[PDB]
PDB file of C-alpha atoms in Angstrom:
ATOM      1  CA  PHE U   3      83.956 110.142  83.626  1.00 46.89           C
ATOM      2  CA  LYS U   4      82.588 106.893  83.612  1.00 47.31           C
ATOM      3  CA  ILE U   5      80.524 107.752  86.198  1.00 49.05           C
ATOM      4  CA  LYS U   6      77.644 109.988  85.302  1.00 49.13           C
ATOM      5  CA  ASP U   7      76.967 112.624  87.856  1.00 49.17           C
ATOM      6  CA  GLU U   8      73.601 111.294  88.485  1.00 47.33           C
ATOM      7  CA  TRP U   9      74.970 107.693  89.251  1.00 47.37           C
ATOM      8  CA  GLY U  10      77.394 109.873  91.910  1.00 46.63           C
ATOM      9  CA  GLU U  11      74.660 111.415  93.521  1.00 42.23           C
ATOM     10  CA  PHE U  12      72.848 108.240  94.026  1.00 43.29           C
ATOM     11  CA  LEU U  13      75.948 106.936  95.409  1.00 43.86           C
ATOM     12  CA  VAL U  14      76.097 109.224  97.923  1.00 46.71           C
ATOM     13  CA  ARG U  15      72.842 109.541  99.033  1.00 47.80           C
ATOM     14  CA  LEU U  16      72.955 105.097  99.091  1.00 48.33           C
ATOM     15  CA  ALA U  17      75.829 105.628 101.275  1.00 49.59           C
ATOM     16  CA  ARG U  18      74.478 108.085 103.861  1.00 49.39           C
ATOM     17  CA  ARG U  19      70.600 105.911 103.773  1.00 52.03           C
ATOM     18  CA  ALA U  20      72.823 102.452 104.665  1.00 50.08           C
ATOM     19  CA  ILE U  21      74.419 104.126 107.123  1.00 48.65           C
ATOM     20  CA  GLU U  22      71.683 105.706 109.364  1.00 44.55           C
ATOM     21  CA  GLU U  23      69.559 103.131 108.337  1.00 44.68           C
ATOM     22  CA  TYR U  24      72.509 100.290 109.720  1.00 40.55           C
ATOM     23  CA  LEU U  25      72.687 102.677 112.680  1.00 42.98           C
ATOM     24  CA  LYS U  26      69.105 102.658 113.964  1.00 42.60           C
ATOM     25  CA  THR U  27      67.984  99.304 112.642  1.00 42.07           C
ATOM     26  CA  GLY U  28      71.278  96.991 112.184  1.00 42.41           C
ATOM     27  CA  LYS U  29      69.934  95.929 109.093  1.00 38.50           C
ATOM     28  CA  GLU U  30      71.655  96.499 105.937  1.00 36.17           C
ATOM     29  CA  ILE U  31      69.744  98.026 103.346  1.00 36.75           C
ATOM     30  CA  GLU U  32      69.075  95.999  99.763  1.00 31.02           C
ATOM     31  CA  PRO U  33      70.092  97.872  96.350  1.00 30.53           C
ATOM     32  CA  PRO U  34      67.036  99.442  95.958  1.00 31.03           C
ATOM     33  CA  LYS U  35      65.090  98.465  92.511  1.00 31.28           C
ATOM     34  CA  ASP U  36      65.233 101.285  90.963  1.00 30.21           C
ATOM     35  CA  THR U  37      69.636 100.841  90.539  1.00 30.57           C
ATOM     36  CA  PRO U  38      70.627 102.124  87.248  1.00 27.17           C
ATOM     37  CA  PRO U  39      71.941  98.682  85.558  1.00 27.06           C
ATOM     38  CA  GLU U  40      75.823 100.431  84.882  1.00 28.63           C
ATOM     39  CA  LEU U  41      75.907 100.385  88.753  1.00 24.85           C
ATOM     40  CA  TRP U  42      75.658  96.690  89.014  1.00 25.50           C
ATOM     41  CA  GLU U  43      79.152  96.286  87.681  1.00 28.44           C
ATOM     42  CA  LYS U  44      82.167  95.265  89.777  1.00 26.15           C
ATOM     43  CA  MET U  45      84.597  98.249  90.784  1.00 22.10           C
ATOM     44  CA  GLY U  46      86.362  99.748  93.476  1.00 24.68           C
ATOM     45  CA  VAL U  47      85.119 102.010  96.144  1.00 25.42           C
ATOM     46  CA  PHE U  48      85.678 103.895  99.100  1.00 26.53           C
ATOM     47  CA  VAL U  49      83.456 105.600 100.825  1.00 29.99           C
ATOM     48  CA  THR U  50      84.937 108.448 103.628  1.00 29.62           C
ATOM     49  CA  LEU U  51      82.906 110.677 106.509  1.00 30.57           C
ATOM     50  CA  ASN U  52      84.514 114.317 106.787  1.00 26.95           C
ATOM     51  CA  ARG U  53      83.554 116.078 109.583  1.00 27.74           C
ATOM     52  CA  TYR U  54      81.500 119.409 108.274  1.00 24.10           C
ATOM     53  CA  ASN U  55      82.431 123.028 108.914  1.00 21.65           C
ATOM     54  CA  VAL U  56      85.837 122.140 110.240  1.00 21.59           C
ATOM     55  CA  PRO U  57      89.600 122.944 108.586  1.00 26.64           C
ATOM     56  CA  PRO U  58      89.804 119.702 106.234  1.00 27.59           C
ATOM     57  CA  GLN U  59      93.026 118.405 107.447  1.00 25.85           C
ATOM     58  CA  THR U  60      91.295 117.938 110.512  1.00 26.80           C
ATOM     59  CA  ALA U  61      87.910 116.421 108.991  1.00 24.95           C
ATOM     60  CA  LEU U  62      88.095 112.288 108.454  1.00 22.34           C
ATOM     61  CA  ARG U  63      86.014 110.644 110.948  1.00 21.75           C
ATOM     62  CA  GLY U  64      86.339 107.222 108.789  1.00 21.32           C
ATOM     63  CA  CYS U  65      87.315 105.931 105.260  1.00 18.90           C
ATOM     64  CA  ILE U  66      87.103 102.373 104.539  1.00 18.15           C
ATOM     65  CA  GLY U  67      86.844 100.528 100.780  1.00 16.28           C
ATOM     66  CA  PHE U  68      87.316  97.814  98.575  1.00 18.16           C
ATOM     67  CA  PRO U  69      90.182  98.253  96.174  1.00 14.77           C
ATOM     68  CA  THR U  70      89.465  95.460  93.663  1.00 12.34           C
ATOM     69  CA  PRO U  71      86.079  94.953  91.788  1.00 11.87           C
ATOM     70  CA  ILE U  72      84.498  91.988  94.059  1.00 13.16           C
ATOM     71  CA  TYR U  73      81.167  93.609  94.281  1.00 10.70           C
ATOM     72  CA  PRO U  74      78.750  94.984  91.899  1.00 11.14           C
ATOM     73  CA  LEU U  75      79.047  99.284  92.922  1.00 11.21           C
ATOM     74  CA  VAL U  76      75.867  99.851  94.323  1.00 13.94           C
ATOM     75  CA  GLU U  77      76.681  96.864  96.686  1.00 14.04           C
ATOM     76  CA  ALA U  78      80.452  97.141  97.540  1.00  9.30           C
ATOM     77  CA  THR U  79      79.279 101.101  98.340  1.00  9.43           C
ATOM     78  CA  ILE U  80      76.616 100.175 100.888  1.00  7.19           C
ATOM     79  CA  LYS U  81      78.858  97.861 102.645  1.00  7.20           C
ATOM     80  CA  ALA U  82      81.470 100.254 103.072  1.00  8.46           C
ATOM     81  CA  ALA U  83      79.959 103.513 103.747  1.00  9.45           C
ATOM     82  CA  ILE U  84      78.299 101.130 106.696  1.00  7.58           C
ATOM     83  CA  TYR U  85      82.180  99.694 106.992  1.00  5.56           C
ATOM     84  CA  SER U  86      83.209 103.260 107.459  1.00  5.63           C
ATOM     85  CA  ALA U  87      80.668 104.534 109.862  1.00  3.28           C
ATOM     86  CA  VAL U  88      81.480 101.550 112.353  1.00  2.00           C
ATOM     87  CA  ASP U  89      84.031 100.015 110.971  1.00  3.91           C
ATOM     88  CA  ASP U  90      87.129 101.484 110.648  1.00  3.81           C
ATOM     89  CA  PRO U  91      89.370 100.412 114.148  1.00  7.17           C
ATOM     90  CA  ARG U  92      91.345 103.895 113.971  1.00  9.29           C
ATOM     91  CA  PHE U  93      88.076 105.608 115.239  1.00  7.89           C
ATOM     92  CA  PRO U  94      85.050 105.237 117.595  1.00  6.34           C
ATOM     93  CA  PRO U  95      81.759 104.131 115.724  1.00  5.38           C
ATOM     94  CA  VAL U  96      79.878 106.646 114.268  1.00  4.49           C
ATOM     95  CA  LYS U  97      76.417 107.702 115.890  1.00  4.85           C
ATOM     96  CA  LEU U  98      73.120 108.366 114.426  1.00  3.19           C
ATOM     97  CA  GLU U  99      72.742 111.872 115.666  1.00  2.19           C
ATOM     98  CA  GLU U 100      75.971 112.277 114.541  1.00  2.00           C
ATOM     99  CA  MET U 101      75.207 112.056 110.917  1.00  2.00           C
ATOM    100  CA  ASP U 102      73.838 115.540 111.191  1.00  2.00           C
ATOM    101  CA  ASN U 103      76.967 116.980 111.701  1.00  2.00           C
ATOM    102  CA  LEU U 104      78.947 114.894 108.771  1.00  2.00           C
ATOM    103  CA  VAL U 105      79.271 114.596 105.045  1.00  2.00           C
ATOM    104  CA  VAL U 106      79.533 111.720 102.590  1.00  2.00           C
ATOM    105  CA  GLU U 107      82.060 110.907  99.882  1.00  2.00           C
ATOM    106  CA  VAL U 108      82.090 108.137  97.808  1.00  2.49           C
ATOM    107  CA  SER U 109      85.608 107.690  95.796  1.00  2.00           C
ATOM    108  CA  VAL U 110      84.932 104.760  92.597  1.00  3.84           C
ATOM    109  CA  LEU U 111      87.824 103.656  91.339  1.00  4.56           C
ATOM    110  CA  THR U 112      89.569 102.314  88.208  1.00  4.16           C
ATOM    111  CA  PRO U 113      91.128  99.127  87.794  1.00  3.07           C
ATOM    112  CA  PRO U 114      94.744  99.671  89.814  1.00  5.94           C
ATOM    113  CA  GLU U 115      98.130  99.295  86.772  1.00  5.04           C
ATOM    114  CA  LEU U 116     101.345  98.683  88.200  1.00  3.51           C
ATOM    115  CA  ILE U 117     103.738 101.212  87.291  1.00  2.00           C
ATOM    116  CA  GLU U 118     106.445  99.371  85.359  1.00  2.04           C
ATOM    117  CA  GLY U 119     110.674 100.496  84.646  1.00  3.62           C
ATOM    118  CA  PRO U 120     113.657 101.337  86.862  1.00  4.71           C
ATOM    119  CA  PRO U 121     112.087 101.671  90.041  1.00  5.32           C
ATOM    120  CA  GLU U 122     113.989 104.807  90.594  1.00  7.15           C
ATOM    121  CA  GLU U 123     111.629 105.921  87.913  1.00  7.46           C
ATOM    122  CA  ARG U 124     108.913 105.628  89.511  1.00  7.75           C
ATOM    123  CA  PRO U 125     107.977 108.597  90.882  1.00 10.24           C
ATOM    124  CA  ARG U 126     107.617 109.829  86.845  1.00  6.89           C
ATOM    125  CA  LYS U 127     104.731 107.951  85.749  1.00  8.98           C
ATOM    126  CA  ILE U 128     102.679 108.889  88.869  1.00 11.84           C
ATOM    127  CA  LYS U 129     100.896 112.807  88.900  1.00 14.73           C
ATOM    128  CA  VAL U 130      99.565 113.890  92.447  1.00 13.75           C
ATOM    129  CA  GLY U 131      96.223 115.730  91.606  1.00 11.58           C
ATOM    130  CA  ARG U 132      95.374 112.365  89.263  1.00 13.93           C
ATOM    131  CA  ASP U 133      96.526 109.464  90.574  1.00 12.16           C
ATOM    132  CA  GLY U 134      95.989 106.879  93.465  1.00 14.69           C
ATOM    133  CA  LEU U 135      98.563 104.850  94.770  1.00 11.53           C
ATOM    134  CA  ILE U 136      98.699 101.020  95.894  1.00 12.12           C
ATOM    135  CA  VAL U 137     101.947  99.545  97.121  1.00 13.11           C
ATOM    136  CA  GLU U 138     102.524  95.934  97.783  1.00 10.72           C
ATOM    137  CA  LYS U 139     105.708  93.667  98.920  1.00 12.39           C
ATOM    138  CA  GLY U 140     105.303  90.141 100.796  1.00 12.44           C
ATOM    139  CA  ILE U 141     101.969  90.246 102.732  1.00 11.05           C
ATOM    140  CA  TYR U 142     102.327  94.048 102.906  1.00 13.08           C
ATOM    141  CA  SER U 143     100.141  95.885 101.528  1.00 14.03           C
ATOM    142  CA  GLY U 144      98.660  99.690 101.689  1.00 13.67           C
ATOM    143  CA  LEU U 145      96.768 102.349  99.449  1.00 12.59           C
ATOM    144  CA  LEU U 146      95.702 105.739  99.187  1.00 12.93           C
ATOM    145  CA  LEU U 147      93.380 107.317  97.570  1.00 13.54           C
ATOM    146  CA  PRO U 148      93.795 110.145  95.602  1.00 13.15           C
ATOM    147  CA  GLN U 149      92.911 113.208  97.249  1.00 12.23           C
ATOM    148  CA  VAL U 150      94.854 112.693  99.866  1.00 14.90           C
ATOM    149  CA  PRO U 151      98.147 113.735  98.770  1.00 12.64           C
ATOM    150  CA  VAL U 152      96.855 117.048  97.472  1.00 10.04           C
ATOM    151  CA  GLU U 153      94.913 117.629 101.272  1.00  9.78           C
ATOM    152  CA  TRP U 154      98.849 117.768 101.973  1.00 10.48           C
ATOM    153  CA  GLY U 155     100.429 118.780 100.208  1.00 11.41           C
ATOM    154  CA  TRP U 156     102.698 115.867  99.213  1.00  9.30           C
ATOM    155  CA  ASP U 157     104.843 115.845  95.791  1.00  9.13           C
ATOM    156  CA  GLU U 158     105.050 111.945  93.206  1.00  9.91           C
ATOM    157  CA  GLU U 159     108.300 110.884  95.875  1.00 10.09           C
ATOM    158  CA  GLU U 160     106.851 112.338  99.367  1.00 10.63           C
ATOM    159  CA  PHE U 161     103.133 110.693  98.038  1.00 10.73           C
ATOM    160  CA  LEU U 162     104.917 107.205  97.272  1.00 12.05           C
ATOM    161  CA  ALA U 163     107.019 107.075 101.098  1.00 13.85           C
ATOM    162  CA  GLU U 164     103.589 107.842 102.376  1.00 13.70           C
ATOM    163  CA  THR U 165     101.764 104.965 100.240  1.00 12.47           C
ATOM    164  CA  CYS U 166     104.908 102.619 101.903  1.00 13.94           C
ATOM    165  CA  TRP U 167     104.242 103.464 104.910  1.00 13.98           C
ATOM    166  CA  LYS U 168     101.352 102.971 105.164  1.00 12.90           C
ATOM    167  CA  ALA U 169     101.655  99.750 103.945  1.00 13.31           C
ATOM    168  CA  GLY U 170     103.483  98.978 107.224  1.00  9.71           C
ATOM    169  CA  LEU U 171     107.073  99.539 104.584  1.00  8.98           C
ATOM    170  CA  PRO U 172     109.867 101.046 104.922  1.00  8.30           C
ATOM    171  CA  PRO U 173     109.538 105.007 103.841  1.00  8.24           C
ATOM    172  CA  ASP U 174     112.014 104.048 100.764  1.00  7.66           C
ATOM    173  CA  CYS U 175     110.589 101.054  99.628  1.00  9.03           C
ATOM    174  CA  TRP U 176     109.505 101.804  96.819  1.00 10.29           C
ATOM    175  CA  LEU U 177     112.998 101.726  95.425  1.00 12.61           C
ATOM    176  CA  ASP U 178     112.470  98.004  95.654  1.00 14.34           C
ATOM    177  CA  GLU U 179     112.634  95.876  92.045  1.00 13.71           C
ATOM    178  CA  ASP U 180     110.453  93.509  94.073  1.00 14.25           C
ATOM    179  CA  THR U 181     108.209  95.732  95.458  1.00 11.15           C
ATOM    180  CA  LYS U 182     104.770  96.229  93.650  1.00 13.18           C
ATOM    181  CA  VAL U 183     103.586  99.546  92.977  1.00 11.19           C
ATOM    182  CA  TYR U 184     100.153 100.173  91.723  1.00 12.30           C
ATOM    183  CA  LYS U 185      98.537 104.126  90.157  1.00 15.01           C
ATOM    184  CA  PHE U 186      94.318 103.923  89.946  1.00 14.44           C
ATOM    185  CA  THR U 187      92.233 107.110  89.236  1.00 13.69           C
ATOM    186  CA  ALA U 188      89.015 108.067  90.504  1.00 10.53           C
ATOM    187  CA  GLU U 189      86.087 109.991  89.869  1.00  8.24           C
ATOM    188  CA  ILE U 190      85.138 111.585  93.584  1.00  6.47           C
ATOM    189  CA  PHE U 191      81.191 112.659  94.973  1.00  4.34           C
ATOM    190  CA  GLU U 192      81.099 114.564  98.088  1.00  4.86           C
ATOM    191  CA  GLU U 193      77.629 116.007  99.642  1.00  2.00           C
ATOM    192  CA  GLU U 194      77.849 119.799 100.012  1.00  2.00           C
ATOM    193  CA  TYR U 195      76.748 119.914 103.579  1.00  2.00           C
ATOM    194  CA  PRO U 196      75.056 117.453 105.119  1.00  2.00           C
ATOM    195  CA  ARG U 197      71.951 115.981 103.335  1.00  2.00           C
ATOM    196  CA  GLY U 198      72.487 119.106 100.662  1.00  2.00           C
ATOM    197  CA  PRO U 199      72.716 118.596  96.565  1.00  2.00           C
ATOM    198  CA  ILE U 200      75.623 116.395  96.502  1.00  2.00           C
ATOM    199  CA  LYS U 201      78.314 116.988  93.618  1.00  2.00           C
ATOM    200  CA  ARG U 202      81.604 115.914  91.651  1.00  2.00           C
ATOM    201  CA  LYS U 203      84.734 116.993  92.941  1.00  2.00           C
ATOM    202  CA  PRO U 204      87.429 117.540  90.836  1.00  2.00           C
ATOM    203  CA  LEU U 205      91.707 117.300  92.492  1.00  2.00           C
TER     204      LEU U 205
END
């Protein structure tokens, strides 16, 4: 575990606070002075907002992140949290009252690593329940978090085709040598219920 449980809890609470404060004052909070030093290191992160007490496959309310380590983790979390609440083009922006009915999930990512070898053998180098994926070709790029294939019950080959689709590429694009496929992992933390205890979420 690269991210201590205490740090995951910190980040999830920070994400909720960033969203509520933004919705209330339009201001983006700053990393708190008590922020753990290790959390200033640049890392990729995604924040997901899920509707509470509904079937999981119907819960996604917002999900935005920074796949690359361009921001210190603490700052990336604050921004991604806000973006997931009001800047996810697929859904209407979250209003303050609704935060009573949503649970926050923070996914801290490890650096993506290029999958090597014959393209038709790429499914063998990935593992649903462990890997997140990024597919890139030309100007197209798409990413799907590790929890996605698990939630929908996809195998490695299906997961690949779905990530290609996410990028705006044909489903079988991963069979192309010129298509670049990266795998990455994440340490996930989520509220058990709105404003309740936070816990690590294994796949």
